[PDB]
Ligand binder design. Structure first.
Ligand SMILES: C[C@H]1CCCN(S(C)(=O)=O)[C@@H]1CO
Length: 182
């Protein structure tokens, strides 16, 4: 409808795949080469389905901060025959608050879904499903099961991936440029 949705659509149409694990179907953001991200609660194994194609996992790393606290981001390298558009220049360098964010989802259940979530708070610490978690962003939208892995954008920035909710608020794990230096 506007430039927020325009930037979100541009990311969804080139930089997302549908990932399926034994824990369900997830929006999965491709960042560069064969490297993508997914919430750590997806429990990625040796094999994953990418757009319903059996795909070997070449590497999978559940990120933690230097306090050894969960970040809820898993970085996956996929045995895929095609590279993602490199979007690392749209990643923030620092933890921040944001205005006017969009959460975008693409699964079998929720295709071509875009949610204007509004103001995004650097919330920081969250007890997420019983697990102490750092670098959490919060937005005031009643997100539901099926939205995990959803991409959070502003105009010009890819800032996080949806990892949970409490029925009234939704929570995303930050994406930082420093996670994807090679
Ligand atoms: C292609 C296989 C990879 C290993 C796991 N299995 S399975 C029966 O779902 O456990 C996949 C079958 O589609």
């Amino acid at each position: 409808m506007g430039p927020g949705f325009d930037f979100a659509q541009a990311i969804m149409k080139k930089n997302t795949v549908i990932a399926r694990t034994e824990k369900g179907e997830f929006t999965m953001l491709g960042v560069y080469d064969r490297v993508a991200v997914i919430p750590t609660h997806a429990s990625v194994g040796e094999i994953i389905y990418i757009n319903d194609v059996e795909t070997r996992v070449l590497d999978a790393c559940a990120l933690r901060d230097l306090t050894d606290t969960n970040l809820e981001i898993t970085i996956v390298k996929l045995d895929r025959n095609q590279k993602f558009r490199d979007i690392r220049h749209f990643l923030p360098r620092c933890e921040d608050d944001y205005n006017d964010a969009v959460l975008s989802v693409h699964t079998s259940k929720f295709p071509n879904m875009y949610i204007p979530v509004g103001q995004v708070t650097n919330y920081g610490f969250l007890n997420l499903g019983g697990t102490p978690t750092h670098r959490i962003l919060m937005y005031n939208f009643p997100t539901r099961a099926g939205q995990c892995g959803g991409v959070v954008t502003t105009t010009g920035k890819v800032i996080g991936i949806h990892v949970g909710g409490n029925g009234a608020q939704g929570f995303a794990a930050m994406l930082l440029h420093s996670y994807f230096t090679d």
